[PDB]
Coordinates of C-alpha atoms and ligand atoms in Angstrom, one line a residue:
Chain A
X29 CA 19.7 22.3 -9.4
X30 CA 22.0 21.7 -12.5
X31 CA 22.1 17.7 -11.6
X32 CA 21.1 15.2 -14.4
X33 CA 19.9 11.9 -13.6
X34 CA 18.9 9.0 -16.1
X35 CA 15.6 7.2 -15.4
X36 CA 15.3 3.7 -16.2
X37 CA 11.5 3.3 -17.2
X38 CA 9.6 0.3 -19.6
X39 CA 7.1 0.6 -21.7
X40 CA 3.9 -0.2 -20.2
X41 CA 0.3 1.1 -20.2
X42 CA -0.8 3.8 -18.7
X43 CA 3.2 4.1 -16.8
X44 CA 5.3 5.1 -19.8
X45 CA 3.7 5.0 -23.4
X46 CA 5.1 6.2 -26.5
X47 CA 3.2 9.3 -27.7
X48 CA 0.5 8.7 -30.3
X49 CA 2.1 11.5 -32.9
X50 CA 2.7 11.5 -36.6
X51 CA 5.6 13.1 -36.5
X52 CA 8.6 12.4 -35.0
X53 CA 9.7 13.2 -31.5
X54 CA 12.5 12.3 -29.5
X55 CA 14.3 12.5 -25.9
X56 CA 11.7 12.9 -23.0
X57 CA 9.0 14.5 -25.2
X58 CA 8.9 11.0 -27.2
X59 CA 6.8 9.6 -23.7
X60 CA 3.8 10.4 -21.5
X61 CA 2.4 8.2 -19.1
X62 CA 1.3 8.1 -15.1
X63 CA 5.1 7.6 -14.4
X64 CA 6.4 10.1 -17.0
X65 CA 3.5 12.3 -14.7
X66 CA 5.3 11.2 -11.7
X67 CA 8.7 11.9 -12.2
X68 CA 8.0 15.7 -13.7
X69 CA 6.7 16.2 -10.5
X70 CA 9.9 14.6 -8.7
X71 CA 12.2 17.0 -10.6
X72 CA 10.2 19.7 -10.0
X73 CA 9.9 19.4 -6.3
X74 CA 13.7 18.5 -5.8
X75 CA 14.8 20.9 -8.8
X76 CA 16.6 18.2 -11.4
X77 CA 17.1 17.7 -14.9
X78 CA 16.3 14.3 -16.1
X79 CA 16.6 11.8 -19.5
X80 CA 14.0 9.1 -19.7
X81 CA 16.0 6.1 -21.2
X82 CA 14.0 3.0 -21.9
X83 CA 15.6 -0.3 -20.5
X84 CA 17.6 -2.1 -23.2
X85 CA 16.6 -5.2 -22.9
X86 CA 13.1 -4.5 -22.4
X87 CA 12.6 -6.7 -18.9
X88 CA 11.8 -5.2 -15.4
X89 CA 14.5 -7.3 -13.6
X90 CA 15.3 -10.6 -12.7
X91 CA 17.7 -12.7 -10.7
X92 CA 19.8 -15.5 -12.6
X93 CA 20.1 -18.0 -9.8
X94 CA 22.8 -19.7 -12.2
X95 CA 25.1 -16.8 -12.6
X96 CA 23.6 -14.4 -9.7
X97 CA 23.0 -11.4 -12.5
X98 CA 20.3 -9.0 -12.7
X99 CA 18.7 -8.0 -15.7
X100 CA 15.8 -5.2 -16.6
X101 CA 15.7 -2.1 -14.6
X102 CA 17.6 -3.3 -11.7
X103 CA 20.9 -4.3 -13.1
X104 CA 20.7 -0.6 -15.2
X105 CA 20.9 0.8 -11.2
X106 CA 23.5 -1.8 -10.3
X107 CA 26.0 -1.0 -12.9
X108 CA 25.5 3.0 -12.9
X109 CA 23.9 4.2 -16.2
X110 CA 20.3 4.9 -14.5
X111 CA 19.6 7.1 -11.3
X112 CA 16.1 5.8 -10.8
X113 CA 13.7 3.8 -12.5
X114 CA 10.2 4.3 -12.4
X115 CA 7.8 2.2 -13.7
X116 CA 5.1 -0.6 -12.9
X117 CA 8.3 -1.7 -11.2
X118 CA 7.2 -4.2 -7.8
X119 CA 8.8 -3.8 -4.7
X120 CA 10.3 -7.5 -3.9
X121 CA 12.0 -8.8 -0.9
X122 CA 14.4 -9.8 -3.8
X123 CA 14.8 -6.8 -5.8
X124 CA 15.4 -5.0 -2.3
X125 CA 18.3 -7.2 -1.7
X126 CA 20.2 -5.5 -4.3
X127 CA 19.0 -2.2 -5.0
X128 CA 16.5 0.5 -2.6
X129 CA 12.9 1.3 -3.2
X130 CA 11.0 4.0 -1.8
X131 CA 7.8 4.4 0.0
X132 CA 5.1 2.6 -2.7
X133 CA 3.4 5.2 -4.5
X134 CA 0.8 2.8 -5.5
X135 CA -1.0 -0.8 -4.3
X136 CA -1.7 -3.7 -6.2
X137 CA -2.2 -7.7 -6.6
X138 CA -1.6 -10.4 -9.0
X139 CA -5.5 -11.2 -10.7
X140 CA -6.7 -12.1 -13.9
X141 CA -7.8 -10.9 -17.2
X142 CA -10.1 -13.1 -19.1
X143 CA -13.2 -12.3 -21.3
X144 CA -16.7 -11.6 -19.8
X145 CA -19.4 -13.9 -19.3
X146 CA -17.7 -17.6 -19.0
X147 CA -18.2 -20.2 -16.2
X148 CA -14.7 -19.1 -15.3
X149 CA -14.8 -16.8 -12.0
X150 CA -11.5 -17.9 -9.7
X151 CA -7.9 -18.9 -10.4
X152 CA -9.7 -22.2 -9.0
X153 CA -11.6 -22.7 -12.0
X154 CA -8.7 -22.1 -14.1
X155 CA -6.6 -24.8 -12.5
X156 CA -8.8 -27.5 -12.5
X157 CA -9.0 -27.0 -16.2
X158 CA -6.5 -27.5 -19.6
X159 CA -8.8 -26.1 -22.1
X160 CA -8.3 -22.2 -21.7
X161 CA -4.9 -21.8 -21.6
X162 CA -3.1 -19.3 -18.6
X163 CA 0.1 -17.7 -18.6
X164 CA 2.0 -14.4 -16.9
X165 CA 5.0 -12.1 -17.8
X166 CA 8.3 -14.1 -18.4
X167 CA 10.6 -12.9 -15.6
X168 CA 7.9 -10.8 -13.6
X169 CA 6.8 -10.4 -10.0
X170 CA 3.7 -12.2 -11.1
X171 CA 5.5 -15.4 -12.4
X172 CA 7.8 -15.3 -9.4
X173 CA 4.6 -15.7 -7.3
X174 CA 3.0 -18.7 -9.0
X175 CA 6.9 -20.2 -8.9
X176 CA 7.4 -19.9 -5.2
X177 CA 3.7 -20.5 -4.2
X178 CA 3.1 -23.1 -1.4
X179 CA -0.5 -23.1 -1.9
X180 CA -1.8 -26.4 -4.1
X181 CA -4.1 -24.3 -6.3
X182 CA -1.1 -21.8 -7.4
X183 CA 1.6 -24.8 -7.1
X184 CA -0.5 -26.5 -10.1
X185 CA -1.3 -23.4 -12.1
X186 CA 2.5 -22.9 -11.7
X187 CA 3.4 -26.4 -13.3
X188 CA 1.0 -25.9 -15.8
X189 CA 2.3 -22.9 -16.9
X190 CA 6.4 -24.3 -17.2
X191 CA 5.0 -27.5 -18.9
X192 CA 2.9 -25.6 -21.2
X193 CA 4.2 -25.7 -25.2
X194 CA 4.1 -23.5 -27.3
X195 CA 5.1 -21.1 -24.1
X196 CA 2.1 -19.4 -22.4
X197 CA 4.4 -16.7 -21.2
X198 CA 4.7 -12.9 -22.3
X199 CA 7.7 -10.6 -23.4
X200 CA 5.0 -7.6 -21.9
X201 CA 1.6 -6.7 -20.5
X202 CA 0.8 -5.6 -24.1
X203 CA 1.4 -8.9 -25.7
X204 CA -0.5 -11.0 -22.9
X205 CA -3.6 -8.1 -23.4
X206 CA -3.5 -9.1 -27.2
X207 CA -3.5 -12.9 -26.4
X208 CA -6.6 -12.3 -23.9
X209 CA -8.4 -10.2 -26.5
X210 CA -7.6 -12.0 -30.1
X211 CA -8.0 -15.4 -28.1
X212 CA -11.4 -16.0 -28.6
X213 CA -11.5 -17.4 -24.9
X214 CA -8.8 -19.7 -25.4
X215 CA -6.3 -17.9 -23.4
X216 CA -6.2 -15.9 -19.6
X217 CA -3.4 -13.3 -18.6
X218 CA -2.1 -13.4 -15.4
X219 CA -1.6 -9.9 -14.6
X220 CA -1.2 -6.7 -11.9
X221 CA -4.6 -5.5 -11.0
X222 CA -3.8 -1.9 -11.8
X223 CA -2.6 -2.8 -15.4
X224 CA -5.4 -5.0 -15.8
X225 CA -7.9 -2.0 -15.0
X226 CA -6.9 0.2 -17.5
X227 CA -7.6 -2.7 -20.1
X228 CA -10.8 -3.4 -18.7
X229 CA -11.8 0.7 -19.1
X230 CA -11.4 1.0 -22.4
X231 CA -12.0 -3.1 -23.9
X232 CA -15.7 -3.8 -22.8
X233 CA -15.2 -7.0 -23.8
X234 CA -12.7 -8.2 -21.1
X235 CA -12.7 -8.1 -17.1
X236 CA -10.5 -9.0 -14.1
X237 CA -11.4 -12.6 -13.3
X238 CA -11.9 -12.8 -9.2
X239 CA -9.9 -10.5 -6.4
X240 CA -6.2 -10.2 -6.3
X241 CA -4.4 -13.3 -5.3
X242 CA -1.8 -11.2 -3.3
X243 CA -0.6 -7.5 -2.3
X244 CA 2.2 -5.7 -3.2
X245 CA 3.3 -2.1 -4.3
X246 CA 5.4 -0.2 -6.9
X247 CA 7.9 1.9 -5.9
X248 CA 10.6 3.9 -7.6
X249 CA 14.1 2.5 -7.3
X250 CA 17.5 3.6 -6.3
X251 CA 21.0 2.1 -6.5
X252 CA 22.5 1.1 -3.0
X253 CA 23.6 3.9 -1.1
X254 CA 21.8 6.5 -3.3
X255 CA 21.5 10.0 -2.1
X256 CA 18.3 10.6 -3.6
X257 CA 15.9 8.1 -2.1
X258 CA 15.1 9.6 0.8
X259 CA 14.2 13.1 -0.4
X260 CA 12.2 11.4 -3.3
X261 CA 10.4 9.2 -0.1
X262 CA 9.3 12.8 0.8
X263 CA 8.1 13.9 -2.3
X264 CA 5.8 10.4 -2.4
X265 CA 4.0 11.6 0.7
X266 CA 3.6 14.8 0.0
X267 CA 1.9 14.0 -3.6
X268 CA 0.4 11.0 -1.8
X269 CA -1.2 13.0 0.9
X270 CA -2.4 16.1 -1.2
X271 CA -4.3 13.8 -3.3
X272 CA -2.3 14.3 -6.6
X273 CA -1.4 10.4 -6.9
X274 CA -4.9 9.7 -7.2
X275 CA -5.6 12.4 -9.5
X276 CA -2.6 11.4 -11.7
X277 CA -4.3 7.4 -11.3
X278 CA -7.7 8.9 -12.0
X279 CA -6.1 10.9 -15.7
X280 CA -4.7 7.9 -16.8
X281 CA -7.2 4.9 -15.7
X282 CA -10.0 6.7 -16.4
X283 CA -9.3 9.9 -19.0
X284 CA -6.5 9.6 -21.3
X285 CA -6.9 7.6 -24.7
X286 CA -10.6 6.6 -24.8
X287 CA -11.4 5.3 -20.4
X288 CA -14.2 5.4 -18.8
X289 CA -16.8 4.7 -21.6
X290 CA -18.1 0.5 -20.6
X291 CA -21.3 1.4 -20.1
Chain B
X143 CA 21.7 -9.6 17.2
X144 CA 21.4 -11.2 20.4
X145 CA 20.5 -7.4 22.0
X146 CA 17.5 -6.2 23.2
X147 CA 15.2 -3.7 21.5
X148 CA 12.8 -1.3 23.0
X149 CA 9.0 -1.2 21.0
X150 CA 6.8 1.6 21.5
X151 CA 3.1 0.6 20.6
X152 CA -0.4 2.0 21.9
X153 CA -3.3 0.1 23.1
X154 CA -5.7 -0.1 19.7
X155 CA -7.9 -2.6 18.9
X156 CA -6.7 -5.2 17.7
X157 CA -3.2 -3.9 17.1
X158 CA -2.4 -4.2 20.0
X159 CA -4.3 -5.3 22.7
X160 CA -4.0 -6.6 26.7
X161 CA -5.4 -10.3 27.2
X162 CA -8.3 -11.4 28.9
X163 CA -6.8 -13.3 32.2
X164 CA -8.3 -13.5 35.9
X165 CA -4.3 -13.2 36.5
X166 CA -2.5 -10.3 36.5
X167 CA 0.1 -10.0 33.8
X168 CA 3.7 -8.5 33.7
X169 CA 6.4 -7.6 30.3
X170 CA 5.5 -8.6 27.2
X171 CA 2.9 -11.4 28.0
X172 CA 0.2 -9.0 28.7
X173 CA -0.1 -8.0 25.3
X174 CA -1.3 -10.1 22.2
X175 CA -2.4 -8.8 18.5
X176 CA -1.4 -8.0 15.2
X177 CA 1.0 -5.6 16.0
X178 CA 2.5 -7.9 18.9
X179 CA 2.4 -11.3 16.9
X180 CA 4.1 -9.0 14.2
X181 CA 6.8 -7.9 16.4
X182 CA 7.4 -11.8 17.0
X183 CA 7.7 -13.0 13.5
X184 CA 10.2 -10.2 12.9
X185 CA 12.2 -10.7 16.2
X186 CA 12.0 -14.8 15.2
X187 CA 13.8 -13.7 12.0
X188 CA 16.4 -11.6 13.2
X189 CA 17.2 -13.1 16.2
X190 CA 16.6 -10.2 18.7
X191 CA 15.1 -9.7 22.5
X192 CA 12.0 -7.2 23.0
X193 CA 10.2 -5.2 25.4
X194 CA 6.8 -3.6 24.8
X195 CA 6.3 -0.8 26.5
X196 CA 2.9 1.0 26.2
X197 CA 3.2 4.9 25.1
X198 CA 3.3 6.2 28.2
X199 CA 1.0 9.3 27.1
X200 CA -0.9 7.5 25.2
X201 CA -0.6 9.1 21.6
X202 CA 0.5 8.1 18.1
X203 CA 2.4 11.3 18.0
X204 CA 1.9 14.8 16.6
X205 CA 4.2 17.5 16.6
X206 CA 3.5 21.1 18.3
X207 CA 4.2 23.3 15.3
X208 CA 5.4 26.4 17.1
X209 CA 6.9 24.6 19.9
X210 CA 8.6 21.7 18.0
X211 CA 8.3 19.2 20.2
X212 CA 6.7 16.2 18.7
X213 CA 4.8 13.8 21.8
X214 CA 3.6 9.9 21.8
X215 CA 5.2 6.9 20.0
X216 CA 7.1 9.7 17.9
X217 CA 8.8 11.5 20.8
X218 CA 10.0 7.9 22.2
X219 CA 11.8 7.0 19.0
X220 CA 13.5 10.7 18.5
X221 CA 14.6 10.5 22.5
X222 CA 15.7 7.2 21.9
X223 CA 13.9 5.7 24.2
X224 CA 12.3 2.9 21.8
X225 CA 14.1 1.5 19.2
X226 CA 11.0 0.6 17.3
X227 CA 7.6 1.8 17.0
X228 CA 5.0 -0.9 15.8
X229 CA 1.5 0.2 15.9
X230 CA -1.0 1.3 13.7
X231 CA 0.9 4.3 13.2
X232 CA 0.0 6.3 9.7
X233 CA 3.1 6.8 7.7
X234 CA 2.9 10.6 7.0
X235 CA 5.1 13.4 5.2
X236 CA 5.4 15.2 8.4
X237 CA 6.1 12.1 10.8
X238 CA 8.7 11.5 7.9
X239 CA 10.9 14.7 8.7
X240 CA 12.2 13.4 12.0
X241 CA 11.9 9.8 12.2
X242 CA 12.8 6.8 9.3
X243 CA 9.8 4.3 8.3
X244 CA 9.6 0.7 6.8
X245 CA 8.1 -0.2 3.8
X246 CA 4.4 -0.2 5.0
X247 CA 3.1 -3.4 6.3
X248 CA -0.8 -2.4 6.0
X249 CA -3.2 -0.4 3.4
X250 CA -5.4 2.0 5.1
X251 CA -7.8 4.8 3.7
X252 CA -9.9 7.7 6.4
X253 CA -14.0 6.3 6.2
X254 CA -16.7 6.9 8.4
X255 CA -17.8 4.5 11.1
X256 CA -21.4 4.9 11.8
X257 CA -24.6 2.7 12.7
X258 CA -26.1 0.5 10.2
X259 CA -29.5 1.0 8.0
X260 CA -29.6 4.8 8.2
X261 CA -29.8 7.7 5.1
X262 CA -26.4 8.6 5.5
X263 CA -24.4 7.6 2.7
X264 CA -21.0 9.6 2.5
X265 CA -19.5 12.2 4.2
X266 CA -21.2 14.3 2.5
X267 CA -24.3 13.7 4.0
X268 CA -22.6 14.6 7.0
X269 CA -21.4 17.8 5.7
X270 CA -24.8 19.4 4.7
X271 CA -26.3 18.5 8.0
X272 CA -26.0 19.8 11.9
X273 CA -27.9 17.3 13.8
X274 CA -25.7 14.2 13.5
X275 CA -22.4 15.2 15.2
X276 CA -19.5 13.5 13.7
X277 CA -15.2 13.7 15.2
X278 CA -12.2 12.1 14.9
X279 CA -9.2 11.1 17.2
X280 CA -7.3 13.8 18.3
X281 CA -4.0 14.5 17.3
X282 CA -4.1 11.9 14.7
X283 CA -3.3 11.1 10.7
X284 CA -7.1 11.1 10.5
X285 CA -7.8 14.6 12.0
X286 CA -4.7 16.4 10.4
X287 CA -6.2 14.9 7.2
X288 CA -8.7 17.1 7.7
X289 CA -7.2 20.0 9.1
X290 CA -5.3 20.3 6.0
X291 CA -7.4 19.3 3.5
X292 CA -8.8 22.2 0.1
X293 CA -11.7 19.7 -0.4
X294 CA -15.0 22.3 0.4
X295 CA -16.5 19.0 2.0
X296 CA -13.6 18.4 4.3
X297 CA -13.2 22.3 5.0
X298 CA -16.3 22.3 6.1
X299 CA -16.0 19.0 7.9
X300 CA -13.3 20.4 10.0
X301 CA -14.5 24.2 10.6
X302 CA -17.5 21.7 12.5
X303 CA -15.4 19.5 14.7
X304 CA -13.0 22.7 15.4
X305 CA -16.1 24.3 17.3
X306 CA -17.8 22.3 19.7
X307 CA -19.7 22.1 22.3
X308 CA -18.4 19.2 24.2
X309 CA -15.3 17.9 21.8
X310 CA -16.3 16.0 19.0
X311 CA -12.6 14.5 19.2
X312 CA -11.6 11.6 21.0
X313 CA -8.5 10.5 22.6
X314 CA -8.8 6.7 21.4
X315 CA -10.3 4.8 18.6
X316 CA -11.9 2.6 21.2
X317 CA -13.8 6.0 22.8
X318 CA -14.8 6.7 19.4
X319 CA -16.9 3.3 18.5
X320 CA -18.5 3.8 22.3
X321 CA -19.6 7.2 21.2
X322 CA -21.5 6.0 18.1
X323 CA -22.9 3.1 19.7
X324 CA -23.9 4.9 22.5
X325 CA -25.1 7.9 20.3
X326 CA -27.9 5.9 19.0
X327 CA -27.3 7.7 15.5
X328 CA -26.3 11.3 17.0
X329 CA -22.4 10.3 16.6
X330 CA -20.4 9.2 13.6
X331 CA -16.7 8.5 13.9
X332 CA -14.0 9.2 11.6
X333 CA -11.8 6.4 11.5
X334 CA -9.3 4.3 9.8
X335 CA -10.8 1.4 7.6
X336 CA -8.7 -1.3 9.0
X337 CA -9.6 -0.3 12.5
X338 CA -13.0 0.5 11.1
X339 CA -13.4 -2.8 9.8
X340 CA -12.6 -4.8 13.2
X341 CA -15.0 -3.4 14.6
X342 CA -18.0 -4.0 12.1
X343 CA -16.8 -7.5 12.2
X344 CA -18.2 -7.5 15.7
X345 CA -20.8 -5.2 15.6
X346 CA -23.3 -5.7 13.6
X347 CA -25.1 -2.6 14.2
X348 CA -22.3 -0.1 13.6
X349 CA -20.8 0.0 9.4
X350 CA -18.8 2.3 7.5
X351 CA -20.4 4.9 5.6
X352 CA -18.8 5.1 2.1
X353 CA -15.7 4.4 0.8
X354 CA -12.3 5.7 1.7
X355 CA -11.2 9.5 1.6
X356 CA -7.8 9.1 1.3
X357 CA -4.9 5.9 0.6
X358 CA -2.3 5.3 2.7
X359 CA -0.5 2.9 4.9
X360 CA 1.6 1.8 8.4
X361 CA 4.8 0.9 8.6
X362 CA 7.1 0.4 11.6
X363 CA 9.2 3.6 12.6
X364 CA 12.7 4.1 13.8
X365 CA 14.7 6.6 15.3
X366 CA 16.5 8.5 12.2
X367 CA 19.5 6.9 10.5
X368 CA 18.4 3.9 12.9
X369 CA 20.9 1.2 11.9
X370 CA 17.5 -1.8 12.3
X371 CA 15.8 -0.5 9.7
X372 CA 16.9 -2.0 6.6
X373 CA 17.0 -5.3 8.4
X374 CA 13.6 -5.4 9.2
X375 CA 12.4 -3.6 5.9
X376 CA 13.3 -7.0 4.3
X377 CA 11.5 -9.3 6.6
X378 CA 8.5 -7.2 5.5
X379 CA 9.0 -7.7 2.3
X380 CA 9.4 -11.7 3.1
X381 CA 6.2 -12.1 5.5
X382 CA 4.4 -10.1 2.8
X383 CA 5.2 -12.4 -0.2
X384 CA 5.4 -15.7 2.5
X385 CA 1.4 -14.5 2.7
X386 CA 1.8 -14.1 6.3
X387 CA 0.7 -10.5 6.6
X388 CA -2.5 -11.7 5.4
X389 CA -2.7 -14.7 7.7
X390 CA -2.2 -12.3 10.6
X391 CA -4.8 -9.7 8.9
X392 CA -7.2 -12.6 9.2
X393 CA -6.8 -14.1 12.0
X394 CA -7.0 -10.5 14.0
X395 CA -10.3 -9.4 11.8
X396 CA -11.6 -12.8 11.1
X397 CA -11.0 -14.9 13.8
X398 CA -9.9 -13.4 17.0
X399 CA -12.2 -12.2 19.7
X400 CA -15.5 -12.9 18.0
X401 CA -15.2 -12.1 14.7
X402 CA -17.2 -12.9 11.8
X403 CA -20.9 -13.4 13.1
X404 CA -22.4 -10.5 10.9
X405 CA -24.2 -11.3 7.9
Ligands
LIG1081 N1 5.5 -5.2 -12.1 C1 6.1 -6.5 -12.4 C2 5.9 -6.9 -13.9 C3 4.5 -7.3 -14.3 C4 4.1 -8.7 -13.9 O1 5.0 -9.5 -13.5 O2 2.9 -9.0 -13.8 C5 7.5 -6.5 -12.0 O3 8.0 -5.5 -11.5 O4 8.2 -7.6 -12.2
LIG1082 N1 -3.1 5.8 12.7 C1 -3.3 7.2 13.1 C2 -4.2 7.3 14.4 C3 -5.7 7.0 14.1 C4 -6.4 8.1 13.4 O1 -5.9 9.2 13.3 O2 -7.5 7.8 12.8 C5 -2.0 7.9 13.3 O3 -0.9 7.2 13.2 O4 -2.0 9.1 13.6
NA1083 NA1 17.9 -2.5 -0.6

């Protein structure tokens, strides 16, 4: 009841956002977001204190093949100074490897944010061409897909995308948003359908560019061996199944900071 | 692994499903869908035997709440007669007490299966009215839904299927599409959209009313602290990201059986 635990989050809209506040805050009160939502109602349920800690090096966690490390959020679980992280964090067959998700609490898949109204409708219209330029999150699920893609159409957006100068890649969502929007159609962001909708509720201007290219899910993570997965699995299900995930999805797609207004 | 494995599944279309054949057939060759080429790709991977063996009474599993005792493809995994159960079996908070799940290899939400070109819209429609009967399958995710639900519509839902005069619940999916198409409009079924959507594949008379009332998912359940689970948890996780779960989604509500003649 006493127990502390250090979450591992990222800054990422609507997940975990800095508050919008003159003043100056600080610890957990500096953040509010769908996952900041999330885990209140963790600790609530399963009565612990907690300390939001933002990832260091700002990355959600990759593998160096070269020197077999983890970065991000996942190598903060592997070496002990986070509990949990929670975030727009994707369950991988990779990450799992290493460290232990829970049940998803929420579904997804790799599409496209472009600007309305242009000949281009598919990832197929984007290969086939050089003149808008296409890029994804450095070190993200999303560039992982494109790298180990069989399929010709993703196989050549891929190759595009490494042979690309300058680099078409992102250090965040955020900064792949602002190269969408200030791009005057010059540039597409690969990007996670459920981070690409709340863009596309509150900039009229831009819109996810076909269906989702894959499936996946987030999921909150857990060093190996952790003894709080499996009650936090039952806390998932229980928000999951009395509706209060979707109402949580529903505040921050669709409420919070200016949604729901494209007419 | 070498060893054989028990899998408890149930006879859902097309989950899992006996073949056509003018010859009688015997072990696991008389079975063939997604849930049985599943089973296949995971045992290819990890290098086990199987047998399927058909829920002997013929239930997903739902526990008796002031006797206890849970029945179906649950009961078989806490007696330890199955090792696995693969089926379109809901991952729920209370299935989640007594047995371990996967990571889910399917997205599911409750709709409403229904005939086509009619006034009915939502469930709501169904709600306010008494002529159009409307049920569910017994026992299952979809009914306890349901049962448990604060939503007025859905209270009001369930007070009409709890009194009947013949049941309005079924003990199959299957028995539920025969009632509406035999109802001739008097019948809706309530009904999983994956299983919904096989169906309207091949039926071009028969739709789903609205949209989905809830989000969840399947997953493949083990006895608890199973010592399989992790193991197959990752070759999820790899069929997912391979794009095979989506092959198989296809070519069981695309391809097989008839599917895809609606326009
Ligand atoms: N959710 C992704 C980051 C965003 C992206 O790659 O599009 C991850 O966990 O790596
Ligand atoms: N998948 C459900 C059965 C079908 C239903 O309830 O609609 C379960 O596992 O209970
Ligand atoms: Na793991």
């Amino acid at each position: 009841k006493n127990k502390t635990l250090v979450v591992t989050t990222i800054l990422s809209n609507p997940y975990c956002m800095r508050k919008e506040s003159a003043i100056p805050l600080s610890g957990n009160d500096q953040f509010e977001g769908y996952a900041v939502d999330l885990i209140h109602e963790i600790s609530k349920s399963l009565g612990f204190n907690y300390k939001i800690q933002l990832v260091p090096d700002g990355s959600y966690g990759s593998l160096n093949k070269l020197t077999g490390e983890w970065n991000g959020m996942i190598r903060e679980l592997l070496e002990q100074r986070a509990d949990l992280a929670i975030a727009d964090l994707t369950i991988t067959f990779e990450r799992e490897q290493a460290v232990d998700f829970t049940t998803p609490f929420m579904n997804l898949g790799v599409s496209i944010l472009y600007r309305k109204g242009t000949p281009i409708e598919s990832a197929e219209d984007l290969a086939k061409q050089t003149r808008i330029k296409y890029g994804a999150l450095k070190g993200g699920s999303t560039a992982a897909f494109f790298r180990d893609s069989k399929i010709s159409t993703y196989q050549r957006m891929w190759s595009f995308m490494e042979s690309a100068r300058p680099s078409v890649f992102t250090a965040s969502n955020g900064e792949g948003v602002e190269r969408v929007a200030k791009g005057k159609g010059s540039y597409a962001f690969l990007m996670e359908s459920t981070s690409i909708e709340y863009v596309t509720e509150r900039n009229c201007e831009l819109t996810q560019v076909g269906g989702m290219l894959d499936t996946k899910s987030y999921g909150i993570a857990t060093p190996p061996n952790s003894p709080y997965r499996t009650a936090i699995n039952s806390v998932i299900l229980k928000l999951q199944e009395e509706g209060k995930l979707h109402i949580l999805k529903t505040k921050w797609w669709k409420e919070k900071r200016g949604g729901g207004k494209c007419r």
